[PDB]
Amino acid sequence: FLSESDELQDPQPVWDAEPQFCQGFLIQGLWELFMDSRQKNPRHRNSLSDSADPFADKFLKPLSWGSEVLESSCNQPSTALWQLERFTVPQALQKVRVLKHQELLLVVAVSSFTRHVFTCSQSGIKVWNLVNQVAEDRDPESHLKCSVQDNKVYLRTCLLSSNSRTLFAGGYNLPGVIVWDLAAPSLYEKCQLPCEGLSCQALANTKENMALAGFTDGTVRIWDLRTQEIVRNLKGPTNSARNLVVKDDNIWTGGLDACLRCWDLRMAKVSLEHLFQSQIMSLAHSPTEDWLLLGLANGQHCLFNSRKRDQVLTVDTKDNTILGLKFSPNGKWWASVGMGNFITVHSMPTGAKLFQVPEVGPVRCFDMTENGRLIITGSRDCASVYHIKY
Amino acid sequence: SLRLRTRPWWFPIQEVSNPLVLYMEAWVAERVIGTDQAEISEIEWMCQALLTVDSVNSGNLAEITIFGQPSAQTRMKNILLNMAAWHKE
Amino acid sequence: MVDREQLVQKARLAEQAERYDDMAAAMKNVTELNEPLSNEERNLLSVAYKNVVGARRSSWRVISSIEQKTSADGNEKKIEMVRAYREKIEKELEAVCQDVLSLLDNYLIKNCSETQYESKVFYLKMKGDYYRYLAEVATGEKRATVVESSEKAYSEAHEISKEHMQPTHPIRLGLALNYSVFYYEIQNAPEQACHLAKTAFDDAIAELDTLNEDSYKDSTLIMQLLRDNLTLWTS
Amino acid sequence: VDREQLVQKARLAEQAERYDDMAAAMKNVTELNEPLSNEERNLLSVAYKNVVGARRSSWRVISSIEQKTSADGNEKKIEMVRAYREKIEKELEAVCQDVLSLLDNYLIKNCSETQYESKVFYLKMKGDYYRYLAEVATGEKRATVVESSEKAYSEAHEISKEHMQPTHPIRLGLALNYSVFYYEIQNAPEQACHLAKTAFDDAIAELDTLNEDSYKDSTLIMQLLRDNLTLWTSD
Amino acid sequence: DLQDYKAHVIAKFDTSVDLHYDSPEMKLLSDAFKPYQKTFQPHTIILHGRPGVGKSALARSIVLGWAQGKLFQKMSFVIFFSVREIKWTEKSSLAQLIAKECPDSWDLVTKIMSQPERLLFVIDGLDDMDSVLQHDDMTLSRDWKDEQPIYILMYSLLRKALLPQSFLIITTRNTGLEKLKSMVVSPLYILVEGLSASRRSQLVLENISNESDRIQVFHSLIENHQLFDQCQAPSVCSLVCEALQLQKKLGKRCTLPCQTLTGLYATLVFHQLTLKRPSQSALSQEEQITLVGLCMMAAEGVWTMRSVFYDDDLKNYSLKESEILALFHMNILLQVGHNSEQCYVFSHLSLQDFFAALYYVLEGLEEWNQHFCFIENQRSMEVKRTDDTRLLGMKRFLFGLMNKDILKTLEVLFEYPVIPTVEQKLQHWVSLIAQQVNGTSPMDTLDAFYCLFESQDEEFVGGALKRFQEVWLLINQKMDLKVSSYCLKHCQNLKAIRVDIRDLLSVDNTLELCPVVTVQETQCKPLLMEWWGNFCSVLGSLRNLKELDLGDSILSQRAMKILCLELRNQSCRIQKLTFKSAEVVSGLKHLWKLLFSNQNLKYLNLGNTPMKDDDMKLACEALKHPKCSVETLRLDSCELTIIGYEMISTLLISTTRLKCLSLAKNRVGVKSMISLGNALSSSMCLLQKLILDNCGLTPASCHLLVSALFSNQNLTHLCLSNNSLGTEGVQQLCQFLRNPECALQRLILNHCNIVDDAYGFLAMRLANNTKLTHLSLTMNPVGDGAMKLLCEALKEPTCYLQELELVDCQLTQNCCEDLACMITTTKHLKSLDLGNNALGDKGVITLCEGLKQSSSSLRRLGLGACKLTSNCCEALSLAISCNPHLNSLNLVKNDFSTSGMLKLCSAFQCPVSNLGIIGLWKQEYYARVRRQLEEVEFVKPHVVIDGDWYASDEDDRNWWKN
C-alpha cells in the first residue's frame, strides 16, 4: 500500500559498539583477571530453508593528537598532473568516535584549528576536545547554559567564527544573541547583541567585524561587534530568512516561500528575485568558484551562478528532504544530509553520487574541518566523528 | 621550590605531561621575554603551545619549557631560535 | 482488573508469537469489558486488526489480478473456480471488517468524552479506514453506501482535528495521508488528493523545528510517507 | 472435476499464500487417488513444510520466553505461559500426526519396487516429520519418535546412496537432513561432520553431471552443507 | 568574635612555622583574583599539579596567611576543610558541619546573619571523590540547613547552587578533572610545577656510582620523561637518590637494572624488608598473606579510582598497620586522621601503582582468597569509567616486573617457582599489534617499544617481537631513538622499515647541548649524534632487512654522513633506498660515496630532490664505477638542467648495470632530445624500462623519440603518459612496432589524446602482433566505433594481448553486445578494465550474457563507477554464480539496494565461484548486508573484501608509478 505505515522504517541499522583500539583491548584483558580472581570462593540448524530472505581482531587506527590518523592513501588507476593532484576527492568514511550529548542535537561546529567540537541543543552548548583517546565520550570540557537567565528560553542556532576566537548563539526567548570569547584564559560571555522580541533561527558573521542574523518574521538585522549597536534592518516576508549566505557585498536569502533574494548592503534594496518549485531548505556557497548550491524540500539539488545569474540547473535528485549542505574546502565535492538515514557525497562538475553511509535516524546537522580531514554528524542525540579516506 | 603558571582553558590537560626542555643564554632570554603579557599570550594562541622561561640556574642561563603537541613544540622552538639568532646577529 | 491484565498479557504474548488471530481475539475480549482503553491497548488492537485485514487484502488483490487474466483466457471451469475462491476470500474479509466496525461503534466510539479529542480522532480515522477496506471490494449500491459512510467518518475526524491539534501531530498527519489516499483511490480525485497532501506537508514543514523530541521520529516518518505519494502523483 | 480441479486450486492457494488451503486440497487429492505426480508431490511437500515451519517458529519463541521467565517463578504468569505453550504443542503434534498418517496409509503403500525417487522422497519426509515430533517431546515418548526417525532416515539413505547419483538434489537434501538429525537430536560431534564431508566431496567431484537443470537447488543445498560443516568444525 | 577565630586558626595550623614567607608566587596568586582581561572577575580557581608537589601546603599557607594580614583582604571567612577526613556519606548539613568542625565558637545566629556577602571556601585535595561522584542530576541545595549527604552538598556548592557569589579555591591532581571540569562555571586554572629541571638533574648526578661508563645510565635516566616528570615530587626524588646510593653500596650483590624506575624501585622494597634471616630464606607463613593482602588492596584501589582506605577497606583483606610496619622497615601506609576515623593513605601514588602491579605477578602461587572475607554486597557487577590515563603507571610497572633477577628474588622469597600468566597475555597483545591487515600504527608500535624496553629482558622481548615483518616509526625525542635501537635488535623477521624524523635532526648547532652540568667534552660526544649513530648501526647490522624508507625526514649534513657511513658496513643487505619526500640535499656527497661501496644496493628512488651539475656528475661517476650495482634509477620531479642530459646520455652509452630509468615530471628540451635519442639508438645501450610521463613532449619531440627508437632492440617497457601525441606520432609508433626484433611488451598511453584514425592504426597493428601483452588506454576520447574496431582486432586468433585498461574512456551501452562477443570469442585476454563508463543496467545486462558462458579465460574484470542500480543485480548474480574462472571483481561507486546486495551475496556464497578479491566498502550498507558479507568472509577465509581494488598487484602492473 502507499497507505498508513506503508513500509516505513521497516529495517534498522544495528549500530556497532565499535571497540577496535589495542590499548582498550589490553586494558580489558587486564581487567578480566580481577573478575576471574574474585569469582572463586549460535545458528540453530540450517536445514532445508533459504536464508537469503530478510526476516584475528581488527583494530581501528587512532586519531593521533586529535589531528590525524597516520595511514596510507589508496591507489589510483592512473597518475595525476600537478594541477590534477591539487584537488582530491574522498572514497570512504570511517567512524572513530561518538560524543554523547544528553538531548536532541540541533547544531554542531568543529574548528579543527583548536581541536574542539561544539554541540548545541535546546538547553545548552557542550564543548568537547578531540585529544581524548576514547571510543565514546560522555564528559565535555565545558557546558554553557543560559536557561537560568530567564523563565523559559530555547536555543536554536550556534555559529563559530572563521578564526576560532568567537562563538555566537541565538534562540527563541532570549533577550539577545549571546557571544562567548574563546581566546581568553577563561570561557566567558562577552556581549549581548540585543534582539528583544524575535526568534533567531539563522546567524552569520562577516570579515569586516560585523554580525548579522535573520529572524522568523523575515527581519534581517546587522550589528557592529565592537560596540553592539544596530547598524541596519531589512524586512521581508514571514518565514523567508531561514537561510542566510554572506558574500563580498551581497546577502543571499532563502526560506519557505520558495524565493531566493539578494540584498545589497550599500543600497539596502533587493537586487534579484527567483522562484523555485518547492521550499528552499538549505543554502551553501563554494569557497573557490562562483556556484551557489540550493537544497530544496522535494529532494532537488540546484546549482546557480552567483555572478552571471543566467539560470539554475538541477544536478542530483535525492529521495529525501535536504536539511544540511556544505562544500569541501577546495570546492570539488559536497555532502548532504536529510531525513533518510544517509549521508551522501557528490562530486562537483556534474553532481554524480560517490558513496553513502547509513545512519540511525534523521540527520539534522553536520560540519567539516577546514583541512578536510574530519566530518561531525549529529543524528539523534550523539555526534559521530568520521575520518575521510582519500 | 614551587612555580605557578596560568593554564588557559583551551589547552588540554593531556599535553602538560611531555614537555620540551632546552637551555639558552640569560642575556638573550631577558630581552627575549620582555616585560608584558600581551604578545606572549598572542604567540601562545597562534602556536597552540605554552612557553615557560626560568632564570634560577647556575647564574647565567635560561631554562625554557615548551608544552603541546610535537608540531606546536617545533613551531615555537623555531620561532625562538630564529629570533634569538637575529638578536645576536 | 485481573482478567483485563491477564488478557492484555496474553495478547502481548500472541504478538510475540505472531499469532495475530489469537491476539485480536484477546484484544476484543479486553474491549468487551466496557472500560476505557489506554494508549497501549489501543495500539495493540490497531496492530492486530491491521495485520489480520492486510493478509486478506493481499490475498484478494493477487486472486483478482490472476482472475482478470483467466477471464481474458476464457475457460469456463477455471472462471467458475476462481470466482468461487474470490467470493470466499471476500466473505472472510467482509466478516472481519464488519466485526471491527460493530465493535468500534458499540463501545469505544461512544464511551469517549467531549474533552477527549485524540481518542475521538483516532476512532473516527479507524472507522474511515475500515469502511474504505470494505469499499475496495464492493460493487453496486453497497459500494456507494460504504463510500459515503467512509466520507462521513473521515470528514468528521478532519473537522475535529483541524482546530484542536498541532499540525505536526502524528495523528493529524496520518489522518491527512489516509484522506489523500482515499481521494486518490476510491473517489478518483487526484487534484484533491494532491492539494490536501501538499497543504498538510507545508503545514508540517512550517513548524518542523518546534516539533517535540518524542514525536519527532513518528512525525518525520509520516512526513516522509507524504511527499512520496505527492511525487508519484505529480509524475 | 475432482483431482485436476483440486490441483489447480492448490496452485491458486500457493500463489495467494494460503498454505492451509493447499494442505486441505492435497490431502483430498492423496486420499482420492493412489498414484501421485512429481509436481503434485512437490507442492504437497511445500504446503505442509510452510505450515509446520510457522508452528515451529511460534513454539520456539514461546519456549524461549518461558525459559527466560521461569527464573522469577511467579505462580500466575507461569501457568498461562505453560498453557499457551501446550496449546501450540497440541497444534503442532496434530499437524505432524496428520502428515505421518497420510504418508503411511497412502504414499508408502502404493509405491512399487521400480519407483525409487518416490520411495526416497517419502521416507525422507517421514523421517523429517518424526524429527519434528521429537524436538518437542520428553522421555520414552521422545525415545520412540527418535528411533522411528532414525530407522526411516537410514532406510532411505541406503537406497539413495546405492542408486542415486551424488549430485541429485534429493540425495543431497537427504544427506543434509540426516547430518542435521545426527548433530541435533541425539549426538554427533564427528558423525554428522563426517557424513556432511563425504556428501559434499561426492557432490563436488562430479558437478558437471548436475548440468543446468538442477543447478540452482543443487548449489543451494551444497552451500547449506558447507555452511553447516564450517560451523560445526569451528565449534 | 573574629579575633578569637583568627587566633584559633593560627593555633590549629601548628604544622609549620617556616614556610610563612611571602613570595612572588603568592603575589601572583593574590593579584590573579582581580578581574582578568577587561572586566571578568573570576569566582572559581582550580589548582592543578602532580601527585606529590606542595599543594595542600600551599592551601594551608593561604588560609594561615589570611589571619595575619598581608594577604587576601576584603574577605570575611576563609573556611577551610580538607575532604580527605570526611567520608562523603554523612547526612550533616553545611551549618552543622561548620558547627562540628568549630570546637567552642558556636555563634550560630551571629555567623549565619553577619557575613552572607564574601566568603572564601578553600577545599583541599578533592582529587578523589571521582568514583563516588554520582553525577546523575544530584539535588541542588539552595540554602543551608539542608540534611543531605555531604557529597551532595559539595556538588551543589560546586555548581554555584549553594551560596552563589561566594569565592572558592579548589586543589586537585591531573586526574580528577575528568568529571570536575564540566561542573564548574568559568574557572581559572593555575598549574603548579614541581622542583625544577636543573635541580633534578643535579640531584640525580650527585648519587652516581662513578666506577664505569655511567654517563649512559645518567642520560637514560634523565631523558625518560615518565621517570623525570614523576620525579618532580621531592619524595620521589629522594627515593630515587636512595635507590641509587643502595645500588652503589651493593656493587655486586645487587644485579637489578639501574634504570626503568622498576629496577631501582624494587631494590628498596626487596632489600629493605627485614634484618633477621641473613641467608636467602622465605619470609614466613603469615607475612606472605600480609604482603598479598596489601598488594591486592592497592590494586583494588587503583581499579576503583580510590586512594584513601578506611578501616572497612582493611579487616576484609585481613590487614593491619602494625603487621605492615613489622613486615617492612618504613611506613608504607600513613595515617592522616585526627579522630575515630583513620583514613590511611599510601605514601605517593607510585607505591600504590607498584603494589598493584606486583599483585598480578604474585597471585596464582596459592589460594589466597580462602584467607579473605570478600562480600562488598556481591562486589556491588563492578563498573568503571577508568579509561587509560591513570593506569599508565600500573601498566609500565607490570611490564617492568617481567624482568629476570626479580622473578628469581620473588621465587627465593616465596620458596615457589614464579611463572605469571600475564606474560603470555602481554606477548599476545604485542603480537596482535604486530600483525595488522592494513599496516601497523606508529603510535601503538612506539607504545609497545616503550613498554618492552621497560623490562630489560631478552627472552621476553625476543618472544614478543617475532611477527612484525614491517615497521613504521615516528621519532621526535631522544628516548624514542634509544628504545627503538634497543628493541630493533630482536626483530629478526623484519623486512621493511620506514622512519620519520621531522625535527629532531635538522640543525647542526652545539649551543644548547645541556650546558648546566655537562661532563668533560674530551671524553664525550654529542648525545643526539651518538644515539643516532647507535640507531644506524642497529639498522645496518640486521640481516633480513631489505627496504628502508626515510619518510618526511629533514636530515642534515652530519646526520646524512653518519647514516651513509653506517650503511657502508659489510653486513648491510639493503636493496632499496627511498628518499622521496625527504630532505637529503645536504649529504648527497656521502650518498654518492656510499653508492659504490655496497654491492647489494640495486634501487634508488631520488624523487623531488633538486640536482645540480656537480651532483649529477658525481652520480654519473658513481654509476659508471665497476663496484656499483644499481639497476633502477628514479629521478622524477628533479630540476634536471640541460647540462645533465649529456651526462645521462654518456652514462647510458657507457658500461652500467642500469636497467630502468624514470625521468618524470621535468621538462625535456628539444636539444636534449637529440642527445637522448643518440644515446638510445646506439647498440651499446641496454635499457629495458624508460618512463617519460608528465614531460614537455611536443609532437615534434615525440617524432624524434620514436625515430631514434626505431633501431633500438632492447627496450621492453615504455610509458608516455600525460603527453601530447598526434596521429603522426601514433603512426610512427605503429611503424616502429611493425618491424621484427622490436621486443616491446608493455606500452602505456594514458593521457595522450588519440583520434579515430590512430585507433584504426592501433587496431591494424593489434590484428596480427606478437610480443605485446599489456596496453593501457585510459582517459582517451575513444568512442563506440573505435571500440568496435578494437574488439574486431582482438577477436583474431593471432592476437596475444593480455591486459586492456579503458578506465575513463567515453564508452556507452552501444558497444556492450560487441564486448560480450569479443569476450566469448577471445582466448588470450584475461584482464579488462571499464572504470568510468556509463554502461548502465542495460549495458551490464548485455555484457552478462557473454560473461556467464565461461567459455573464455577472463580473470580480472573492472566494473566500478558504471552507474549500476539494483536492476542488473539478477544478471550479475547469474553471471558470477557459474563462472569458475573469475578471480577479481570491482564494484565500488555504485548504487545498490538491499535486495540487490542480498542477491549478490547469495551469488558470492556459491561454491562454484572462486573469487579472491572483491572491491566493496562494506560500511556503506545496512546491518543485514554487513552480516551477509561477514558470513561470506567466514566461509571463505582467503577472500579479500577491500575498497582499495588497485592495491592488489598480481603482476608488475604499477611498474611506472613507483
Curated annotation (Swiss-Prot), chain A:
* Induction comment from the UniProt entry of this chain: Induced by E2A-HLF, a chimeric transcription factor containing the transactivation domain of E2A linked to the DNA-binding and dimerization domain of HLF. Induced during TNFSF11/RANKL-induced osteoclast differentiation.
The listed locations are:
Cytoplasm; Nucleus
Sorted alphabetically, the keyword list is: Cytoplasm, Nucleus, Phosphoprotein, Repeat, Transcription, Transcription regulation, WD repeat
Name used for this protein in its record? Transducin-like enhancer protein 6
Which residues of the parent protein does this chain contain?
137 to 581 of 581
The signal peptide annotation in the UniProt record is: none
Q: Summarize the subunit comment.
A: Homodimers. Component of the subcortical maternal complex (SCMC), at least composed of NLRP5, KHDC3, OOEP, and TLE6. Within the complex, interacts with NLRP5, KHDC3 and OOEP. The SCMC may facilitate translocation of its components between the nuclear and cytoplasmic compartments. As part of the SCMC interacts with the SCMC-associated protein ZBED3. As part of the SCMC interacts with the SCMC-associated protein NLRP4F. As part of the SCMC interacts with the SCMC-associated protein CFL1/Cofilin-1. Interacts with FOXG1/BF-1; the interaction inhibits TLE1 interaction with FOXG1/BF-1.
- Comment block on domains: Contrary to other WD repeat Groucho/TLE family members, does not contain any identifiable Q, GP, CcN or SP domains. Only the C-terminal WD-repeat domain is conserved.
WD repeats sit at 56-92, 100-138, 150-190, 193-233, 236-273, 275-314, 317-356, 358-389
The main location is cytoplasm
From Swiss-Prot, chain B:
What does the UniProt induction comment state? Induced by etoposide.
**Impact reported for residue 7 to W/P/G:** Impaired formation of the subcortical maternal complex (SCMC)
Question: In what residue span(s) does the KH domain sit?
Answer: 19-80
Q: From its record, what is one biological process in GO terms?
A: protein-containing complex assembly
CC per GO annotation: apical part of cell; cell cortex; cytoplasmic lattice; nucleus; protein-containing complex; subcortical maternal complex
Its quaternary structure?
Component of the subcortical maternal complex (SCMC), at least composed of NLRP5, KHDC3, OOEP, and TLE6. Within the complex, interacts with NLRP5, KHDC3 and TLE6. The SCMC may facilitate translocation of its components between the nuclear and cytoplasmic compartments. As part of the SCMC interacts with the SCMC-associated protein NLRP4F. Forms a scaffold complex with KHDC3/FILIA, and interacts with BLM and TRIM25 at DNA replication forks.
Q: Write down what this protein is called.
A: Oocyte-expressed protein homolog
Q: State the covered range within the intact protein.
A: 26 to 114 of 164
Swiss-Prot record, chain D:
Highest taxon of the lineage: Eukaryota
- At which residues is Phosphoserine found? 70, 214, 234
Localization per record: Cytoplasm, Cytosol; Mitochondrion matrix
Name one molecular function that GO assigns to this entry.
insulin-like growth factor receptor binding
Q: Where is it expressed, tissue-wise?
A: Expressed in dorsal skin (at protein level).
Renumbered residue ranges of the record's region Interaction with SPATA18/MIEAP: 1-235
- Cited SMART domains: 14_3_3
The processes (GO biological process) annotated in the record are: cellular response to glucose starvation; negative regulation of TORC1 signaling; positive regulation of cell-cell adhesion; positive regulation of T cell activation; positive regulation of T cell mediated immune response to tumor cell; protein targeting; regulation of neuron differentiation; regulation of protein localization
Where are residues bearing Phosphotyrosine located in the sequence?
A: 132
GO cellular component terms, semicolon-separated: cytoplasm; cytosol; mitochondrial matrix; myelin sheath; nucleus
Which controlled-vocabulary keywords does the entry list?
Answer: Acetylation, Cytoplasm, Mitochondrion, Phosphoprotein
Name positions with the PTM N-acetylvaline.
1
- Provide the record's note on post-translational modification: Phosphorylated by various PKC isozymes.
Short name of any one Pfam family annotated for the protein: 14-3-3
Could you say which residues are annotated as the site Interaction with phosphoserine on interacting protein? Answer: 56, 131
Q: Where on the chain is Phosphothreonine found, per UniProt?
A: 144, 233
Q: How does it assemble?
A: Homodimer. Part of a complex that contains DSG3, PKP1, YAP1 and YWHAG; the complex is required for localization of DSG3 and YAP1 to the cell membrane in keratinocytes. Interacts with SAMSN1. Interacts with RAF1, SSH1 and CRTC2/TORC2. Interacts with ABL1 (phosphorylated form); the interaction retains it in the cytoplasm. Interacts with GAB2. Interacts with MDM4 (phosphorylated); negatively regulates MDM4 activity toward TP53. Interacts with PKA-phosphorylated AANAT and SIRT2. Interacts with the 'Thr-369' phosphorylated form of DAPK2. Interacts with PI4KB, TBC1D22A and TBC1D22B.
UniProtKB/Swiss-Prot annotation, chain E:
Every NACHT domain range: 43-365
Name where it's found. Answer: Cytoplasm; Cytoplasmic vesicle, Secretory vesicle, Cortical granule; Mitochondrion; Nucleus, Nucleolus
Loss of this gene results in the following: Mice appear phenotypically normal with no apparent defects in ovarian development, oocyte maturation or ovulation. Cortical granules are scattered throughout the cytoplasm in oocytes and ovulated eggs. Reduced abundance of intact MYH9/MyoIIA and MYO5A, the dense cortical actin scaffold remained present prior to exocytosis. Increase in polyspermy in the perivitelline space resulting from a decrease in efficacy of the zona pellucida block. Increase in multiple pronuclei and delay in cortical granule exocytosis and ZP2 cleavage.
Q: Name one GO cellular component term.
A: cytosol
What broad class describes the main subcellular location of this protein?
cytoplasm
Q: Where does ATP bind?
A: 49-56
One Gene Ontology MF term: ATP binding
Tell me what happens on changing residue 876 to P: Decreased interaction with TLE6
Could you describe the post-translational modifications of this protein?
Phosphorylated by PRKCE.
Q: What is the effect of changing residue 536 to R?
A: Decreased interaction with TLE6
Per the record, the coiled-coil ranges are none
Q: Name one GO biological process term.
A: cortical granule exocytosis
The keyword Ribosomal protein is annotated on this UniProt entry:
no
Q: In the UniProt annotation, what is the result of changing residue 528 to R?
A: Decreased interaction with TLE6
Q: What family does the database annotate?
A: Belongs to the NLRP family.
Name of the molecule in the record: NACHT, LRR and PYD domains-containing protein 5
What organism is listed for this UniProt entry?
A: Mus musculus
